[PDB]
C-alpha cells in the first residue's frame, strides 16, 4: 500500500533502515499502553507479551504522546532464492513487528469504547535500490 | 524538654528482667541443679514490640544475675554461671566436660556477694542483628528465621560435685547499651502468636486502637 | 511528554515528575571491601541495566492491594534473571516506577512503598493455632506479585496506617498517576544471596478505593516498570 | 486565542499552529517574463486578498470525504470570482486552512491534501464499459465541493494509501483540528485559464472514521477558510 | 614454562614458540561500515573472550586425521555458543592452538591448517552415482570434530599434497608439539550467519604416521585450545 513498497517492485534488490510510525486516532479521553516490539530475522514472533518485551520494544502510551515512531534497524532483500520459477532475491531478512496490549483500553463514560490506529511507513535516509525490474500487473490496454 | 530522653540509647537502656532460672531442690523442672538459658532479649515482654520498631540493630549488653531462694532468702551457696559462645556446645549433664572448657567464660560468685554482672559484646557475624529476614538461609519450614543473631547461652549451676542444699531462683537482668537502629518499620498492632514468626490471628484482627460511635460525635 | 531510553527498552513516561529517593541514598557499587576481598565482582552494565515492565495488574473497586519481593521478582524474566540464577553473591540497588492509566472521571489513591525485609505471615491456620510459615508463593511471588489478604495489617500484624514511615509515594488519581522510588541496597551484609533472601518488598495498596460513575472502564491498569541500578555479582556456576 | 485579520474578514483561528508550505515554496507574483511580455498583468491586492469561508461541511460517521477544485471553487462567490470571470489569463497562489470544531469526547482523523491536476473518473458506466468523462459537476464542484464515491482510489484509480506524497496535513481530533497548507501556483504554463483548467484539487478524507459515544452531536463541522496569495490577471472582457 | 591467562581459563602452554598469523592479518573489529549502518553491533569482550579447550582427540597409529568447522565448533559449548545462537549476524576472528603431549620415544608429524569455506563431499554413494550432499554431521561436526575418510583428497577431491598453500603449521614430534594459527575473519560479506555458513575449517592430519616401539602409550592426545579474537554480533532474538 505504501509508495515505498510499490517502488521497490520496480527494483530487484535493496537495503536500508525503515521507519514505521503509529498514530492513535481514538478519543482524547482515551488512555493506555500498547507495547510495540520488533524481532529481527529469525526469532519467531514472541510467544506472549512478556517474552516479547525482553527484546527491542517500545512501550507506547497514548494517554501522553498521541503518536510514536519505531525504527527498523536494517532489512536486506539481497539473499537470492528461486521459488517456483520466479527466482527473485527473496527477503529472508523479514523482521517482525508485533504490537501488544500493555494495559487494557481505558475510557471514561461518554467516550468511544473503541479506537483505531493508523500506520505510516517509509524508508530512512540510508536506503538503496539496485537493478530495475518493470514488473507491473497494471498494464495499458487499448480502449 | 531536652530531646535527650528521645535518643536511642535512652529508649533502649534500663536493666530489664529477661531470664528466671529455677533450681528447686526436688521436683520436675531442672532436676539436675542446673539449666541452660539461651540469651533471648525478648525475655522482657514489651521489648519485642520495641526493638521490632527497626529492621537492623546493633548493641551490647550488661547482664546481671540476682539469685536467691524462692522465699527471697540469702544463703551460703556458691554458684557458677557459664557462657556458651554461639558456636560451642552446651552442657548436658551436671558435669559434662563443658563446664570445664575455658573457651566458655564462667563466673563464680556466692549468694552472699552482690549480684554478678558481665558484658556481652555485639556477637553476630553480620553487620547487625536483624529482626526480619525475608527469605531462607541458603522437609521443614525455615522461613523468616535469621541464623546469626544468636547472642550465646548462659548455663547456671550450683558449684560442686553434689546437689545444692537449698532451693534457688536465679533472675537474669539485661540492659543493652550503645544502640544503633536502622530502617524504621510500622509498629506491631496485632497480638503476637509465636516467638518465631510474625503470624497473627487470621480472623481476630482488631483495629490499631479503640473505636467510637460516629465520626461526627466526639 | 518525554520518553526515557536506557536500554533496548523505551518507556514513554512523563518528562520528570517527583521521585522519592529511598532513605536518601543513590544506589552505588562499592568502595573496595566486601564478602569478597580477592574476588573482584563483575558489575553487569550490559543487558542487566535496561527497563523491565512487569505484567500490568488490574485495579478493581475491590483490589486489596499487591506486593512484590526483590530481588526475586526479576530473577524470573530477564537477563538480570540470568545473572541472579547463575551467580552466588549479589548486591544491587533499584528504581521502581509505578504508572496508572486512568481518566479524569475515575478516582482513587494508591500508597506505593518499599519495605525492607518484608516477612509475610498467613492466617496461621484460620483463627491462630498453626506455626505454618507462609507458602513459597508468598515468600517469592515471582514477577506477577501477590495480593494482600489483610491489607490493614499488611499481612504481618503491622498497621498500614503507618507504612508511610518507609520510602513511599502517593498516587492520587485526581492529582497524578506515575510515582517513582529509587531504592538503595539495604542489607546487613555487603553481598547477600539473590535467590533465597529477598532484600525487601514493594507494596502498592489502594488506600482510597477505586471508583467511577457506572459506564467507565472499571479496571484501571497499574504498570510497574523497574530498572536495576548498579548490579553486582560474584562467582558463576 | 489570536484572530488573524487580513481583509474585511476576521477569522478567530488559533495563535499559530503548524502549517505545511506546499512543495516548499511561498506563492509569489512573477519575475519579468510570461505568456504576456507587452502586457503588464495587474495584481489584485484590493478585495482579492481577504478571507473566504466556504459553507462548512458536516462530517458524519459515514462521510466518504470531500474535494474542491481550484481555482474554480472561488470563481463562484467573491470579488475573486469577479476577477476569474472577467479576465482571460490567470496565475495565483493560495493558502487553505481547514478547521474542525469538535469535543474531547469525539474522535477521528482527517487527511487533508493538495493534489495538482486532480482528474476525476466516475464509474465508467457501472462495471467498466463507457468512456463517460465525469459530469460538469465533478470537474468543477463550485464552492460546495463534492463527495468521493470511492475514497480508496480517490475517484481516479490512485490509492489514497499514498496520498501523503502530496502537500498534506493530518487532523487527528484527539490531537488538533485546524490544519494549514500554503499552495504555490503549480502549472506547466506561467499564465493559464482560471475558468476551464483547475490547477489542482483539495481533498479531505476521513482516514480514521468519525465516532462518539451515543449522545454527542453526531456531526462535526469542518470549516474551510482560504486566502488567495498573489493573484494575477491579464486582459479584461 | 609460562601459562597464558586471558579469561577464567588458564592454559599452561609454552612460553612463546612460533605462531603462524593467517594470511598475514590480525583479526580486528571493523572500520565504520557494514551489513548494518544504523545498527551499532555490540562487541562481546566479556566471557566471549576466554580460552576454550576442546575434548582432546586421541592419535593412533591409524588416525586418518580430523577437522572442525568454524564458527560451528563453538556455537555448541560456551557463552560464545550463547551469542552465536541468540544473534542474527556475526563476524569474528580467531586463534587456534593445537598441542601434543608425547614422549621423545614416539614419532610423527601433523600438518595443521585452516581452509576457508571447507566444503565436504562424501563418497557420492559408493562408486560415484548419487548427488547425496554430505550429512548434517559432516557440514557442522560440533565441538568434537569429524574424521577424514579419504585424507589424501581431504574429502573434497583436492590433494592434501598441496594443503600447505593455506595458513598452516607443522607439528613434527621430534621437533615440537604445540603449533598456533591466528585466523582473521575471511568472508565475502562483512557480517555473515554464525549458524548456517561456516567461515572455514580447521584440518589436522597425520602426514607422517604416529609410531612408537611397543610398550609406550600408543595414543598421543592432541589438545586443541582456541580463543575468539574480536567477536561481533547484531540484533538478538
CSV table of C-alpha atoms in Angstrom, one decimal, chain D:
chain,number,residue,atom,x,y,z
D,1,UNK,CA,-6.5,32.5,21.0
D,2,UNK,CA,-5.5,35.1,18.4
D,3,UNK,CA,-7.7,36.2,15.4
D,4,UNK,CA,-5.9,36.9,12.1
D,5,UNK,CA,-7.4,39.9,10.2
D,6,UNK,CA,-6.3,40.3,6.5
D,7,UNK,CA,-9.3,42.0,4.8
D,8,UNK,CA,-12.9,42.9,5.8
D,9,UNK,CA,-12.8,39.4,7.2
D,10,UNK,CA,-11.8,38.3,10.7
D,11,UNK,CA,-11.3,34.6,11.5
D,12,UNK,CA,-10.7,33.8,15.2
D,13,UNK,CA,-8.2,31.0,14.4
D,14,UNK,CA,-5.6,29.5,16.8
D,15,UNK,CA,-2.5,31.7,17.5
D,16,UNK,CA,-0.1,29.9,15.1
D,17,UNK,CA,-0.2,26.0,15.0
D,18,UNK,CA,1.7,24.1,12.2
D,19,UNK,CA,1.2,24.9,8.6
D,20,UNK,CA,2.6,22.8,5.7
D,21,UNK,CA,4.0,25.1,3.0
D,22,UNK,CA,3.4,23.3,-0.3
D,23,UNK,CA,6.4,21.9,-2.2
D,24,UNK,CA,8.4,24.2,-0.1
D,25,UNK,CA,7.6,27.5,-1.9
D,26,UNK,CA,5.7,30.6,-1.0
D,27,UNK,CA,3.3,31.7,-3.7
D,28,UNK,CA,4.8,34.8,-5.4
D,29,UNK,CA,4.0,37.1,-8.3
D,30,UNK,CA,6.5,36.8,-11.2
D,31,UNK,CA,10.0,37.9,-12.3
D,32,UNK,CA,9.6,39.7,-15.6
D,33,UNK,CA,8.6,37.2,-18.4
D,34,UNK,CA,5.4,35.4,-19.1
D,35,UNK,CA,2.6,34.5,-21.6
D,36,UNK,CA,2.4,38.3,-21.7
D,37,UNK,CA,5.6,40.4,-22.5
D,38,UNK,CA,4.0,43.7,-23.6
D,39,UNK,CA,1.0,43.1,-21.3
D,40,UNK,CA,1.8,44.1,-17.6
D,41,UNK,CA,-0.7,41.9,-15.6
D,42,UNK,CA,-2.5,43.9,-12.9
D,43,UNK,CA,-2.0,42.2,-9.5
D,44,UNK,CA,-5.3,42.3,-7.4
D,45,UNK,CA,-4.2,43.4,-3.9
D,46,UNK,CA,-7.6,45.0,-3.3
D,47,UNK,CA,-10.6,42.8,-2.3
D,48,UNK,CA,-9.0,39.8,-4.0
D,49,UNK,CA,-6.8,39.4,-0.9
D,50,UNK,CA,-9.2,38.7,2.0
D,51,UNK,CA,-10.6,35.7,3.9
D,52,UNK,CA,-13.2,33.4,2.2
D,53,UNK,CA,-15.0,31.0,4.4
D,54,UNK,CA,-16.7,28.2,2.5
D,55,UNK,CA,-20.0,26.7,3.7
D,56,UNK,CA,-19.0,24.3,6.4
D,57,UNK,CA,-19.4,20.6,5.5
D,58,UNK,CA,-20.8,18.2,8.1
D,59,UNK,CA,-18.7,15.2,9.0
D,60,UNK,CA,-20.8,12.1,9.8
D,61,UNK,CA,-19.9,8.6,11.0
D,62,UNK,CA,-20.2,7.8,7.3
D,63,UNK,CA,-18.8,10.7,5.2
D,64,UNK,CA,-16.7,9.3,2.4
D,65,UNK,CA,-14.7,12.5,2.1
D,66,UNK,CA,-14.9,15.6,0.0
D,67,UNK,CA,-12.9,17.6,-2.5
D,68,UNK,CA,-12.8,21.0,-4.1
D,69,UNK,CA,-11.2,22.2,-7.3
D,70,UNK,CA,-9.1,25.4,-7.5
D,71,UNK,CA,-9.3,28.0,-8.9
D,72,UNK,CA,-12.9,27.0,-9.6
D,73,UNK,CA,-14.2,26.8,-6.0
D,74,UNK,CA,-14.0,30.6,-5.7
D,75,UNK,CA,-14.7,31.8,-9.3
D,76,UNK,CA,-18.2,31.5,-7.8
D,77,UNK,CA,-18.6,33.5,-4.7
D,78,UNK,CA,-16.3,36.5,-4.2
D,79,UNK,CA,-14.8,39.5,-5.9
D,80,UNK,CA,-12.1,37.0,-6.7
D,81,UNK,CA,-15.0,35.4,-8.5
D,82,UNK,CA,-15.4,38.7,-10.3
D,83,UNK,CA,-11.8,38.6,-11.5
D,84,UNK,CA,-11.6,35.0,-12.5
D,85,UNK,CA,-14.7,35.6,-14.7
D,86,UNK,CA,-13.9,38.9,-16.4
D,87,UNK,CA,-10.3,38.0,-17.1
D,88,UNK,CA,-8.6,35.9,-19.7
D,89,UNK,CA,-5.2,34.7,-18.2
D,90,UNK,CA,-4.7,33.9,-14.5
D,91,UNK,CA,-1.9,32.9,-12.0
D,92,UNK,CA,-2.4,32.8,-8.3
D,93,UNK,CA,-1.0,31.0,-5.2
D,94,UNK,CA,-3.1,30.1,-2.2
D,95,UNK,CA,-3.4,29.2,1.4
D,96,UNK,CA,-6.1,26.9,2.7
D,97,UNK,CA,-7.0,26.5,6.3
D,98,UNK,CA,-9.3,23.6,7.4
D,99,UNK,CA,-10.7,23.8,11.0
D,100,UNK,CA,-12.7,21.3,12.9
D,101,UNK,CA,-15.0,22.1,15.8
D,102,UNK,CA,-15.4,19.0,18.0
D,103,UNK,CA,-15.2,18.0,21.6
D,104,UNK,CA,-12.7,15.9,23.5
D,105,UNK,CA,-15.5,13.2,23.6
D,106,UNK,CA,-15.3,12.6,19.8
D,107,UNK,CA,-12.6,11.1,17.8
D,108,UNK,CA,-11.3,10.8,14.2
D,109,UNK,CA,-8.6,11.7,11.8
D,110,UNK,CA,-8.8,13.6,8.5
D,111,UNK,CA,-6.1,13.6,5.9
D,112,UNK,CA,-6.1,17.0,4.2
D,113,UNK,CA,-4.1,17.3,1.0
D,114,UNK,CA,-3.5,19.2,-2.2
D,115,UNK,CA,-3.3,17.2,-5.5
D,116,UNK,CA,-2.2,19.1,-8.7
D,117,UNK,CA,-4.3,18.4,-11.8
D,118,UNK,CA,-6.8,16.3,-9.9
D,119,UNK,CA,-8.6,14.4,-12.8
D,120,UNK,CA,-11.7,12.5,-11.8
D,121,UNK,CA,-13.0,9.4,-13.3
D,122,UNK,CA,-16.6,8.2,-12.5
D,123,UNK,CA,-17.7,4.5,-12.5
D,124,UNK,CA,-17.2,4.5,-16.3
D,125,UNK,CA,-20.8,3.3,-16.6
D,126,UNK,CA,-21.2,0.8,-13.8
D,127,UNK,CA,-18.8,-2.2,-14.2
D,128,UNK,CA,-16.4,-0.5,-16.7
D,129,UNK,CA,-17.7,-0.2,-20.3
D,130,UNK,CA,-18.5,3.5,-21.1
D,131,UNK,CA,-15.9,6.3,-21.9
D,132,UNK,CA,-18.2,8.7,-20.0
D,133,UNK,CA,-15.9,11.5,-18.9
D,134,UNK,CA,-17.3,12.7,-15.4
D,135,UNK,CA,-20.1,15.4,-15.4
D,136,UNK,CA,-19.5,19.1,-15.2
D,137,UNK,CA,-20.4,18.6,-11.5
D,138,UNK,CA,-17.2,16.5,-10.7
D,139,UNK,CA,-14.8,18.6,-12.8
D,140,UNK,CA,-15.8,21.9,-11.2
D,141,UNK,CA,-17.9,21.3,-8.0
D,142,UNK,CA,-18.3,25.0,-7.2
D,143,UNK,CA,-17.8,26.3,-3.7
D,144,UNK,CA,-19.7,23.5,-2.0
D,145,UNK,CA,-17.3,20.7,-3.1
D,146,UNK,CA,-18.2,17.2,-4.0
D,147,UNK,CA,-18.1,13.8,-2.3
D,148,UNK,CA,-15.8,10.9,-3.1
D,149,UNK,CA,-17.6,7.8,-4.3
D,150,UNK,CA,-14.6,5.6,-4.0
D,151,UNK,CA,-12.4,7.1,-1.3
D,152,UNK,CA,-10.0,4.2,-1.5
D,153,UNK,CA,-9.0,5.0,-5.1
D,154,UNK,CA,-9.6,8.8,-4.8
D,155,UNK,CA,-12.0,8.5,-7.7
D,156,UNK,CA,-9.1,8.1,-10.1
D,157,UNK,CA,-7.7,4.7,-9.6
D,158,UNK,CA,-4.9,6.0,-7.5
D,159,UNK,CA,-4.6,4.6,-3.9
D,160,UNK,CA,-5.2,7.0,-1.1
D,161,UNK,CA,-2.8,4.9,0.9
D,162,UNK,CA,-0.2,7.1,-0.8
D,163,UNK,CA,-1.9,10.5,-1.0
D,164,UNK,CA,0.6,11.8,1.7
D,165,UNK,CA,3.1,12.1,-1.2
D,166,UNK,CA,1.4,15.4,-1.8
D,167,UNK,CA,1.3,18.6,0.3
D,168,UNK,CA,-0.7,17.3,3.2
D,169,UNK,CA,-1.5,17.7,6.8
D,170,UNK,CA,-3.3,15.5,9.3
D,171,UNK,CA,-6.2,16.4,11.5
D,172,UNK,CA,-6.5,13.9,14.3
D,173,UNK,CA,-9.2,15.0,16.6
D,174,UNK,CA,-7.6,13.9,19.8
D,175,UNK,CA,-4.5,16.0,18.9
D,176,UNK,CA,-5.7,19.0,17.0
D,177,UNK,CA,-8.2,20.3,14.4
D,178,UNK,CA,-7.0,23.2,12.4
D,179,UNK,CA,-4.5,22.3,9.7
D,180,UNK,CA,-3.0,24.6,7.1
D,181,UNK,CA,-1.4,24.3,3.7
D,182,UNK,CA,0.1,27.1,1.6
D,183,UNK,CA,-0.2,26.2,-2.1
D,184,UNK,CA,2.1,27.8,-4.7
D,185,UNK,CA,1.0,28.2,-8.3
D,186,UNK,CA,1.7,24.8,-9.9
D,187,UNK,CA,1.3,24.7,-13.7
D,188,UNK,CA,3.2,23.9,-16.9
D,189,UNK,CA,2.4,27.5,-18.0
D,190,UNK,CA,3.1,30.9,-16.5
D,191,UNK,CA,-0.4,32.2,-17.1
D,192,UNK,CA,-3.3,29.7,-17.5
D,193,UNK,CA,-7.1,29.9,-17.8
D,194,UNK,CA,-8.9,30.5,-14.5
D,195,UNK,CA,-12.2,29.1,-15.7
D,196,UNK,CA,-11.6,25.9,-17.7
D,197,UNK,CA,-8.3,24.4,-16.3
D,198,UNK,CA,-8.3,23.7,-12.5
D,199,UNK,CA,-4.7,24.0,-11.3
D,200,UNK,CA,-5.4,21.4,-8.6
D,201,UNK,CA,-7.7,19.9,-6.1
D,202,UNK,CA,-8.1,19.9,-2.3
D,203,UNK,CA,-9.0,16.6,-0.8
D,204,UNK,CA,-10.1,16.0,2.8
D,205,UNK,CA,-10.8,12.4,3.7
D,206,UNK,CA,-11.7,10.7,7.0
D,207,UNK,CA,-9.0,8.1,7.3
D,208,UNK,CA,-10.0,7.2,10.8
D,209,UNK,CA,-13.8,7.2,10.9
D,210,UNK,CA,-15.6,9.9,13.0
D,211,UNK,CA,-17.1,8.5,16.2
D,212,UNK,CA,-18.7,9.4,19.5
D,213,UNK,CA,-20.3,7.5,22.4
D,214,UNK,CA,-24.1,8.0,21.7
D,215,UNK,CA,-25.5,11.3,22.8
D,216,UNK,CA,-22.9,13.8,21.4
D,217,UNK,CA,-23.6,16.0,18.4
D,218,UNK,CA,-23.0,13.3,15.7
D,219,UNK,CA,-22.0,15.8,13.0
D,220,UNK,CA,-18.7,17.7,13.4
D,221,UNK,CA,-18.4,20.8,11.2
D,222,UNK,CA,-15.4,21.1,9.0
D,223,UNK,CA,-14.8,24.8,8.2
D,224,UNK,CA,-12.6,25.5,5.2
D,225,UNK,CA,-11.2,29.1,5.1
D,226,UNK,CA,-8.9,30.2,2.3
D,227,UNK,CA,-6.9,33.2,1.2
D,228,UNK,CA,-5.7,34.0,-2.4
D,229,UNK,CA,-2.0,34.7,-2.2
D,230,UNK,CA,-0.6,36.8,-5.1
D,231,UNK,CA,-3.5,37.0,-7.5
D,232,UNK,CA,-2.6,37.9,-11.1
D,233,UNK,CA,-4.7,38.6,-14.2
D,234,UNK,CA,-4.3,39.8,-17.8
D,235,UNK,CA,-6.8,41.5,-20.2
D,236,UNK,CA,-10.4,42.1,-19.1
D,237,UNK,CA,-13.6,41.3,-21.1
